[PDB]
Design a protein around this ligand. Sequence first.
Ligand SMILES: O=C(O)[C@H]1O[C@@H](O[C@H]2[C@H](O)[C@H](O)[C@H](O[C@H]3[C@H](O)[C@H](O)[C@H](O)O[C@H]3C(=O)O)O[C@@H]2C(=O)O)[C@@H](O)[C@@H](O)[C@@H]1O
Length: 227
Amino acid sequence: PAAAPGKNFDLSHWKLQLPDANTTEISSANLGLGYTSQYFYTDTDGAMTFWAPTTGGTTANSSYPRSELREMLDPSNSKVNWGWQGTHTMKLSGKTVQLPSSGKIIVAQIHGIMDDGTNAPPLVKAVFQDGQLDMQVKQNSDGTGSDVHNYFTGIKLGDLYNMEIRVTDGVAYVTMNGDTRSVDFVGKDAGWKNLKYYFKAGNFVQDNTSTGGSAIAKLYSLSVSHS
Ligand SMILES: O=C(O)[C@H]1O[C@@H](O[C@H]2[C@H](O)[C@H](O)[C@H](O[C@H]3[C@H](O)[C@H](O)[C@H](O)O[C@H]3C(=O)O)O[C@@H]2C(=O)O)[C@@H](O)[C@@H](O)[C@@H]1O
């Protein structure tokens, strides 16, 4: 009978994307009002808890299901997003409780988006496996090329991680447990200046197999700042 996550976290500038068959989205307002379900709930430890099955519905340009928050600078218009200039920082603490058969989920992101709201590549993906978090930074803004890996080894299932993802003036700074690495993405491809960005945090399950099971990820803190 614990309070729902929207009472414990500031979700006024997040919407929730779900792994039901119809990939339903829950508005910022409904999160604040106390939305909770099998996909999104407060656990006994107070954590904002994201559950998604590998059989879940998937968004138009992903093969994989998610129960994941999507940052909304304007909760009434998803086309309003931030740019490469200035400082944009997401901080979180959390843990991954259960993995699917693939042993891989994504627990935080910066996602690119076109000015018109059209999809663009992810910029940063925090990839969790039992024993390693890889904070991947995409090389090119058109999706060509590969990713710059940033491995933080020794992070296990159930361990508490403290994460920060920051963009300042076209450079990404990725931090786990006080260990920061940087990638100059605008310096790799000036095309990134032609995209906008939004944060994501939750449980984006890198397994779509019918027998893959499901994943659980938890957050104990989540904050975003733009300056
Ligand atoms: O790394 C990834 O997250 C993964 O996501 C894929 O893009 C998704 C993106 O994560 C959002 O879920 C986005 O949400 C938009 C979609 O149209 C949705 O139905 C609703 O209308 O809201 C939209 C929004 O908030 O902008 O949908 C994207 C999508 O088109 O699938 C891909 O980038 C994938 O390759 C990537 O690995």
